[PDB]
C-alpha cells in the first residue's frame, strides 16, 4: 500500500507568483473598479487549495514528492530566444511587467517561472528514468500559451517544450505525444513543434475561447509536422459525454497511430463546471475517466510513461476536487474525500439531444482529422 | 432627468450568507476560503451600483429612498409560520430555513427592504411616477416558494410586489419575464394556478433546480397555458437568447396582453459567471432590454419594472447592469465595456447556433 | 428636527484609487508573500465603510451632500511645482507608479487625486461662504504627508494647502489654523506653510511613527512663520486622557492666541485602538470629545467655521464608528448606531500611573510651546 | 547543510479551523458591516504565512518535522471536565458554535482542536525524550486563554496544560515553567495551575488588554501555588527595551529560583509593532533577543529543554518575519530572509524618557515579585 509509483512535483514558490491587481483578469483603471477581496484570476489559491486537499486526504503519504529544482537559462534557450529571457529577467529584477498578451508578473517572477518549469522538467525526467511510473507537476505559472518569443495568457515560459527538449538532450526520446485537456487552446505547444514530426500535439479546447475566436481544425502542421498537430474545438456547454467521445474517437486513435515513447498531458482543470474562464461542464468523475484513458494508452504504447503538467483552473472552490481525482487515478488509490458536488454536477450534464448532436460534430471532425 | 427609477438601499449590501467556498458549505473536505467568501457576495451587486455612480448616469435617474415592505405585505404570499420562524432566526444568529438559503443576524429586516425596493419600483411604474424602473434587490427572490426559501432567496420579492400593487391598484394581468439563468421556480409556484400573472422563465437547462427542464409545466386549472418554461442548452449565446425572445417570449406577451411587464433580471447568464455556462455579454443585455421596452411600449404604455435577481461575477456583472439601465433610460455614457471584442469573439459558431435555433423552434411550436 | 447645516463631501471615485498589491504596506517580492484577500493598507474599504455606516445610520438624510468637483491643475500649482504635476500626470496616464516614499498609485490616480483634493476645496469654500456651518470631506487619497515636490505616506497631493490657497485666491482669507489629529506627523502641511504666518499648523502625533523617527517639538517655523508651527509628539500607547490633556493645555490656547478666521482639522482616524499603523488607544467616544472641543473653539473664534478633512485610518472594522461619531458631533445629533466596543476600549485605557506621567510630558511641552 | 536539533510541528488541518464571518473580531449584525476581503481576526493566513516563509527560507530542510498526531479525549480530561468535552464534540458534529467568550468554531472544529493540542503535546514529548533539543509547535487554535470549563479568546482547548499533563503521565516530570510572551494575559494557563507548585506560570502582557481591564500583579497563586504565578503587565506602547528589561529582572531570575526541568514558551506574536490586537512595539530582532534569553536559561537550568508553542499573532504581513526569527534562533542558523521593516521598526522604538519610566515600573514589580 504505503508508497505508490506516482510522483507529485510542487514547490512553495509557485504560490508566490502574482499577476497584480485585476478584477478577474480585467486590468484596473478606467471603468474597472479595483477588487475588494480576491484580486486576479490566476490566484495562488486556485492552485494551493489542490495541494491542501491532497495533504488533507492523506494521499501525499503515498506519493513520491521530490524537492523542486528550477530549470537553468540554458534549458530555456532550447525553446526561447536569448533576447526574451534577457528582457524577462530584466523586468523581473525591477518591478515585473507584462511582455506579452495577458501575461503579467511581479518582482521576482522570473525565478518562480524557472522553478515552475523545473517541476515539469523533473516530472518528465523521473518518468523517463523509471524513478516513478507517472507524475503530476503542479506548475504555476502555466506554460501552454507561451510562444517562443511571446508570453501569453498567464504563461511566461514554455514549460512542457522546455521539459521535453531537456529530456531529449539528456536521454534522447524518439517520439512524444502532448495531450492538452486544458479548456483553452495550447497555442504555445502547437507553435513550438508545428514543423516537427517528433512531437504529436493534440489540444481539446472550447471553440473560440482562448486565443479568442480560434477553432483550429484545419491547422494540421507544416513541413515535417504535417499531420502531427490535432485541434479538437468543442462547443461551449460540452460535458463529460462529449469529452469522452472526443477522446474515444480522436485522441486515443491518434495516439495509437503515432506510437509515442512518452505521453505528456497538459492538465488544465478549467473545463470544470463552475470555472469563470470557460463554459464547460466537466467534474471530478470526468477527470477520473480521462486520466484512466491516458493511463491505459500509456500502458499499451510506452510502458506506462505518463507525465501530467498543470496548466489552468480558476475555481478556488472546485478545482481541488478535480485535481484530487486525477492524482488518485494516477496512483491507483481512493481516499475518504467526498466531492460535495458529485451528484449535482452529474445532474447538470446536457440531455441526450444535445449530447447526440455534439457527438455528430465530433464524428465529423474525426473524419477530417483521421482521414 | 430621464423618467427611469433606480431603487437601492445600503442595507441590501449588509446581508451575508456566511462562510462558504463559492456556495459549498465548509466542512471536512471544503477548505474555508481565504479571500472572497460566499457566492452571493455583497460586491456582486454593489459594484453594479458603483459603476452607475462613476458613469454619471445616477444624476439623470430618479432614486427614491428605500422603504421596506411590511409583514402584511409578506402575508399575501407567505404563511405566518414561515415569517415567524424567519424573524426568530434572524433575531438570533441567522440560519437557513430552506435549501441553499443561508442568512445572518438581522437578515429578516434586510429582506423586507429588498422586497420593498421591488414593491416601490412596481408601484411607481403603475402610478406613472417613472416610466420604467430597476430595483437592485438583494437578497433575490425568484426561487422562494411560499413556505420555503431556496437558492439565495428569502422572500418572494416579485409576487409580494405584485400582490401589494393589486391590493391598492387592482391589476388585471401582469407578465413576469425571468432572464436570470436559473429557473424561476418561486415565481412559477406563486401563480401556477392563476391566470392573472403570466410567468415566463428562460433558463439554462438542468441548472438550478439541478436536472430540471420544465417545458411540460404549463400551469394548472385556471393557470393552464399561463406558465412558459424555456430551457436553453448550456453554452447558448446572444443569438440563441434573442431567437427565444423573438419566437416565444414576445409572441406570448402579445397573446396575453399584460397591463404591466416585470423582468426578473439576474445577470448570471453573463459569459464569465461561475454559476452558469451561458455566453451573454453587455451588448446582449442592451438588445434584450430594448426588446422588453418595445413590448411594453406596444402593450402597456411602456410600463416595465426590472427587479434584480442573481449574477455572480464581481468583475463583469457591473457592465451588464450598466447596459440595462442605460437602455431603460435611453442615454449612453462614457463607460466602455473592456470585454466587448473578446466576448463577441467567444460567441458560438453558425453550426451550433443553427442547432440551438431548431431546439427553440421546436419549443415555440409546442408552447403554441 | 429636519436638515442640518453640516456638509459631507464624498465622491465614488475616491474609492477607486488603488495602491497596488502590497502585504499591508510592504511591497511584494522575494520575502513578502502576496496577500490572500485584503491587499494594501490604504484600502478603499478603510474609507468606504465609514460612508456606508453613515448611510445605514440615517444621518445622511440630514447632511448637505454636494456633488464632488475636482480641483484644477492651476489650483495644484499654488502649492506644487509644474514638474511634479507633469510627472504625476505622465505616470498616471501610463500604468501608475510611485514618485516618492510609500506613495504608490495606479492608472488614473491623478484624476482621482484631483477629485479628492476637490472635496477638501469645496468643504472649505462652502464653510467660508456660509453654505454650511461645518463640513467633513472624505478625501482619499489623503494629503497631509505630501511635500510640495514629493508625495509621501499614501498622499499624492497637498489637499489641505491646495484648498486653503484656493480659498485665498477666491475670498482673501487671512488667518487659518490647521489642527492635525491624524496619528502621524503632518509634515506636508508643515512644509507648505513653514515660513508663513497666515496658517498656524498644529500636529498631534505618535512620537517617532511617521515620518519614522521624527518628534519635532523644536521645529516651530522660520521667518514670518516663527511660532506658527506646533508639534505635539505623544508617546505610543497614549489614550483619551492624554489626548484630551494635550488639546486642553496646548491646542486650545494656541488657537486662542492665533485668532484664526477658519479652523481646518486634518482628521485621520488612525489613532484608534485597533489600528495597525499606530499604537494609540483612542475610540469613538474620544473623537466626540475632540470634535466638540474644536467646535467650541470655532464657535468662540470664527463663528463656527470648521472644516474637517479626512486623512488616514486603517482599521476596516473600527474606523467607521470613529468617523460616525465625528459627523454626529458636527451635526449635533445622535443616531441609533451602537459602537460594539465602547465597553472594552474604555477598559483598555491606560492606568493612572501612566496617565500621570504622560500628563507631565504634555505639561513640559506646553511650557516650551506656550 | 545538515540537520539541526530543532523540531517544527505543524499540520495542514490547523489552517482549516474557521471562526466564521467577523469584521476583525466584531460579530456581524446591525451596525458591523460584513467584511469584503479578509474575514475574522484569527485567520488561517496569520499562521500559514509563517510556515510559508519558513519553507521559502530553506530552513525547513534542516528542521525535524514529524507528522502531526492529535491528543485523545483521555488527554483532554486531565484538564477539562467531561461536560465541556461532550458539549464541544456535540456542537462540532453539528455546525459549530461558541461555548465561551469570543471562541467561535465551525463544523469539525473539535477534531482540529485535538490536532492543534497534539502538536504541542508531541513537541514537549520529543524535547523530553531527546528526539530534538528544542521545538516550535504551530498550534491553531491557540490555547492560553482557555479555562478548564470555558473556552475564551480564540482558544478552545488548554493546549499547553494538556501537553504538560500528558508528559507527566508518561515521563513523571517534576517542575515545568511556562513563560507566556503572547501580548495578552495567559489566564487559561494561570487558572489550570493556580493552586499547584509543579508549574511556574509567568505571563508578560499588555496592561488591561485581554482579558480587558486585567493587570494581575497581585494574583500570585493560592495554596501550594502561592508564589508560583507571576504576572508582568507592561504599559501599552512598550518596545524592545522594556520587554528585555522585564525578562532580565523578573522572568530570568524567577526561572533561576524555580529550577524547572523543562521550559515552555507560550509564543504569541501579537506584541509585534503592527498588530491590530495590541499596542506593543516588538519586531523581529526583539524575538531573536527573547528567544536567545530563553535558550540560555534552558541551557543553564534544564539541558536546553525548551518547547515553544504558538498562541496569537494577527498581522498577516508581519507575523511571518517574527516567527521566522524565533525558529532561526532555536535552530542556531541564519537564512537569506530580509525583514523589510528592520530599519523602520527600530526608528519607531520609544525614546529614552519613556524607556526610563517603563524601566522604573518594571523595577517596582521586580521588588514586589522577587526582591
Ligand atoms: O409540475 C408540478 C407543479 O406543481 C405545482 O403545485 C407547483 O406549484 C408548480 O410550480 C409545479 O411545477
Ligand atoms: O502615515 C502613513 C504611514 O504610516 C506608517 O505607520 C506606516 O508604517 C507607513 O507605511 C505609512 O505610509
Ligand atoms: O486566574 C486564576 C485564578 O484567579 C483567581 O483570582 C481566582 O480566585 C482563582 O480561582 C483562579 O483560578
Ligand atoms: K487544450
Ligand atoms: K430564468
Ligand atoms: K498629526
Ligand atoms: K502573556
Ligand atoms: Zn486554460
Ligand atoms: Zn440565477
Ligand atoms: Zn496617519
Ligand atoms: Zn494574544
Author numbering:
A (entry chain D), D (entry chain F): 9 to 379
B (entry chain H): 11 to 378
C (entry chain A): 9 to 378
Question: How do the authors describe this structure?
Answer:
Structurally, these enzymes are composed of a central eight-stranded parallel β-sheet flanked by α-helices on each site, known as the α/β-arginase/deacetylase fold. All active site residues were conserved, as shown by the multiple sequence alignment and the structural alignment, suggesting a general acid/base catalytic mechanism for the bacterial enzymes as described for the eukaryotic counterparts. These enzymes mediate catalysis using a penta-coordinated catalytic Zn2+ ion coordinated by two aspartates and a histidine (KpHdaH (1b): Asp181, Asp269, His183).
This cluster contains enzymes with efficient lysine deacetylase activity, but also evolutionary divergent enzymes as RwDmhA (1b) and RsPrpH (1b) developed to be active as small molecule amidohydrolases. For RsPrpH (1b) acting as arylamidase converting the pesticide propanil to 3,4-dichloraniline rather than lysine deacetylase. RsPrpH (1b) was isolated from wastewater showing activity as propanil hydrolase for which Zn2+ has inhibitory potential. For the cluster 1b enzyme RsPrpH (1b) the deacylase activity was almost nondetectable, only for the H3-derived peptide APRKac we observed a weak deacetylase activity. Only for RwDmhA (1b) and RsPrpH (1b), which evolved toward non-protein substrates, the second proline is substituted for an Ala suggesting this position being important for substrate specificity to accommodate the product. For RwDmhA (1b) and RsPrpH (1b) we discovered a hydrophobic 22-LFL-24/32-LYF-34 motif in the L1-loop lining the substrate binding tunnel, the sequence 98-GHLAP-102/107-GMLAP-111 as well as the sequence 342-MAEAW-346/352-MFALW−356 in the C-terminal α-helix lining the active site rim. For RsPrpH (1b) and RwDmhA (1b) the data suggest that these enzymes represent examples for divergent evolution developing toward an activity to convert specific substrates, i.e. propanil or dimethoate, while losing their efficiency to deacetylate lysine side chains, supporting that enzymes with different activities might be present within a cluster.
